[PDB]
Design a protein around this ligand. Structure first.
Ligand SMILES: *[C@@H]1O[C@H](CO)[C@@H](O)[C@H](O)[C@H]1NC(C)=O
Ligand SMILES: *[C@@H]1O[C@H](CO)[C@@H](O)[C@H](O)[C@H]1NC(C)=O
Ligand SMILES: *[C@@H]1O[C@H](CO)[C@@H](O)[C@H](O)[C@H]1NC(C)=O
Lengths: 49, 49
């Protein structure tokens, strides 16, 4: 949007967060999508225990 | 907590929660700033370990 940048504006996840007994945020980074090859290119995997 | 600019009135005493961090008492029990420190179910000497 004129800046030649991508910027978050929508954050619709909760109307309230009453009692936060744990909180964390990482050190910041600049997220982007860059570099191309045309086939489906990335597998991502997560295990949660 | 100890160094806060303003403290609460006891009729409305603040009850703050602490977590995700390290409890270093060295600038605390060993420090001149208090005319009383009493512990009641630990030795203050043990608060690091
Ligand atoms: C460009 O970025 C600034 C902050 O860096 C922001 O205030 C402005 O709304 C942005 N403009 C557009 C068109 O996204
Ligand atoms: C959690 O929320 C309830 C309802 O608002 C409240 O009674 C209780 O004191 C809260 N506990 C903490 C630790 O914030
Ligand atoms: C409060 O913090 C100051 C530095 O901001 C320090 O010099 C002082 O010793 C601290 N006092 C207590 C009681 O922790």
């Amino acid at each position: 949007k004129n800046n030649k940048s991508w910027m978050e504006s929508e954050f619709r996840v909760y109307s309230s967060a009453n009692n936060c007994t744990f909180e964390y945020v990482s050190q910041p980074f600049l997220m982007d999508l860059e570099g191309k090859q045309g086939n489906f290119k990335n597998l991502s995997e997560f295990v949660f225990k | 907590v100890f160094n806060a600019t303003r403290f609460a009135s006891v009729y409305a005493w603040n009850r703050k929660r602490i977590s995700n961090c390290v409890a270093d008492y060295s600038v605390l029990y060993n420090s001149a700033s208090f005319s009383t420190f009493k512990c009641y179910g630990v030795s203050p000497t043990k608060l690091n370990d």
